[PDB]
Structure 1
């Protein structure tokens, strides 16, 4: 009856009907100050990144084994892993269907490069966590550029095809990608819904700092390894991170990162919409 399209996407629409997710759209419209894409073409870019992003979120909640998203049951907690995995993979390819409409020969070439960049990120993020091998500050920064720069580059990259603007923004995109992950990492451990990263066992920016700062100690890995829901251990864990100064080390990097963005944002000629956003996200750093 062709309603099959409806049935398959209930898990996908479930995540959309959930609150939040404001940032993805703001960057695409804020970067448009330079790129200035046509309203017709721009709508395509926004719609596709919205799809890909949410689709990746369905997968990431299984990979992280998250129990709650935006305060609601994870999609697969209601529909089950088979239905969620398939629905997300379907959304992926629905995106490629839309990208082909861009009508640009290079849309497919760029779409492939960025998705592979993204999956190598989530691939490393999983390899380190699931093989209990801690990454250095150096590697972590590098895979984050893949993981979160993947969806950024796709949106700004696609826009670049239709713009007469030829100067390169890859440096600003990188700095923003890091600013986002490290901010989300910092907020995750600082302010139910308490230290969600400690239960998932992931290596966040502060936990990575504590692990190398105290080589003689083996406490942070033994707590991360437990994937504990126990608050008292988490409470102690946050205390330790404060004692070793891991929160102080992150802020100074964020403040350091924040500077590069303004310096880089000014050098491209300025975008008032974008500066307002950085000042905003940074108030909690």
Structure 2
């Protein structure tokens, strides 16, 4: 008995799709400050890759997206249950990968970071399903964990196995990672209306729903999206019109600029500390 082809199928399929390598680029860009050996960097890149693949496999299912990068999703080639099983086993694979790093504290780092990531994802799922619009503070503290959790996990693990010296700069890099994840989430939200069908809240939408508590048209359109399975294109342009009248797209520009200013200042401070 040497067959493990119905368990590794979805993982290989999702790993065969094209990607931008943002996490690999982040690992490489953090390696200048923390001079690490090559094989450790390859191990960290592998861990990040498989964790991202598992997250994508789960999110495809939980968002009912027939297409991923123009190509078919994993659950339309293998089924929902097999994809769920493979995603569950990917956690054990990342477990063996982290075990191979020869560091007892990477254990606790991995476990705590996964706990935070799951908390964030649970809050996002509750808000999406129950149709409850969160506040700006709640939404922004959600995306510090759901999206910035991977960056914080990789940063802490990278700092742990770095050669001594670079130990007091963990907090600076953790703050940088949180700001970076916030920037990615807000950028995604922006380049999705000026470019969801499953009633996903966004940064532009919260401002519109808060500054206008009496706007019944937007709320009714969102309710139709909820109890319809999605919106048609003419119903979609109405949401864009409402957001553009409420001035939420510029409110997103303000946040984008503030986050980039914070990123630039953090990077400048980190370069000043090191060198």
- Give TM-score scaled by structure 1 length: 0.89
**Conservation of the 8 A alpha-carbon contact between 1:46 and 1:155:** no
C-alpha distance in 2, partners of 1:223/1:71?
27
Where in structure 2 are the equivalents of 1:10-25 lying within 5 Å? 10-25=9-24
Instruction: Please say which of residues 68-77 and 245-254 is displaced more in the overlay.
Output: 68-77
2:194 matched to 1:190? yes
Q: Does the alignment pair 1:141 with 2:140?
A: yes
Take 1:256 and 1:7, find their aligned partners in 2: how far apart are those partners?
47
For 1:7, what is the secondary structure of its paired residue? coil
Tell me the equivalent position of 1:81: 80
Q: Given the alignment of the two structures, is residue 132 of structure 1 paired with residue 134 of structure 2, yes or no?
A: no
| Contact 2:152 2:178 survives alignment (8 Å) | no
Bigger drift between 22-31 and 110-119 goes to 22-31
- Counterpart in 2 of 1:173? 177
**Most deviating of 225-234 and 23-32:** 225-234
Unpaired segments of 5 or more residues in structure 2?
Answer: none
Instruction: Report the equivalent of 2:2.
Output: 2
Deviation per CA, 1:125-173, whole angstroms, max 9, x where unpaired? 0001111111001000001001011111111111010223111222111
Query: 1:178 Cα shift?
Result: 0.5
State the shift of 1:270 in Å.
6.0
- SS, match of residue 215 in structure 1: coil
Gaps of 5+ in 1: 192-196, 272-285
Give 1:250's aligned residue. Answer: 252
Maintained 8 Å contact 2:155/2:174: no
Distance change >3 Å, CA 270–CA 220, structure 1 → 2: farther
1:63 matched to which residue of 2? 62
Q: Is the contact made by 1:66 and 1:200 (CA closer than 8 Å) also made in structure 2?
A: no
SS across alignment from 2:192: helix
Query: Any idea what SS the aligned residue of 1:35 has?
Result: coil
- The 8 Å contact of residues 144 and 181 in structure 2, kept in 1 or not, is answered as yes
Question: Which residue is 1:282 aligned to?
Answer: none
Residues 223 and 12 of structure 1: CA distance in aligned 2, closer, same or farther (over 3 Å):
farther
1:30 offset after TM fit, Å?
A: 0.8
User: Compared with structure 1, are the counterparts of its residues 30 and 84 closer, same or farther at alpha carbon in structure 2 (3 Å cutoff)?
Assistant: same
Provide runs of 4+ in structure 1 moved above 4 Å. Answer: none
Corresponding pairs, count: 264
> What is the CA–CA distance in structure 1 between the aligned matches of 2:220 and 2:102, rounded to whole Å?
52
Distance 1:16 1:222, change over 3 A: farther
TM-score by structure 2 length? Answer: 0.92
Find 1:268's aligned residue among 267, 270, 273.
270
Alpha-carbon spacing, 1:270–1:15, altered in 2? closer, same or farther (3 Å): farther
Q: Given the alignment of the two structures, is residue 26 of structure 1 paired with residue 25 of structure 2, yes or no? A: yes
* Post-superposition CA distance 1:189-241 (Å, at most 9, x none): 111xxxxx2x0210011111111111111333332333323000101111111
Secondary structure of the 2:101 match is coil
SS at 2:213's partner residue?
coil
> Aligned residue for 1:106?
105
1:247 aligned counterpart, secondary structure: helix
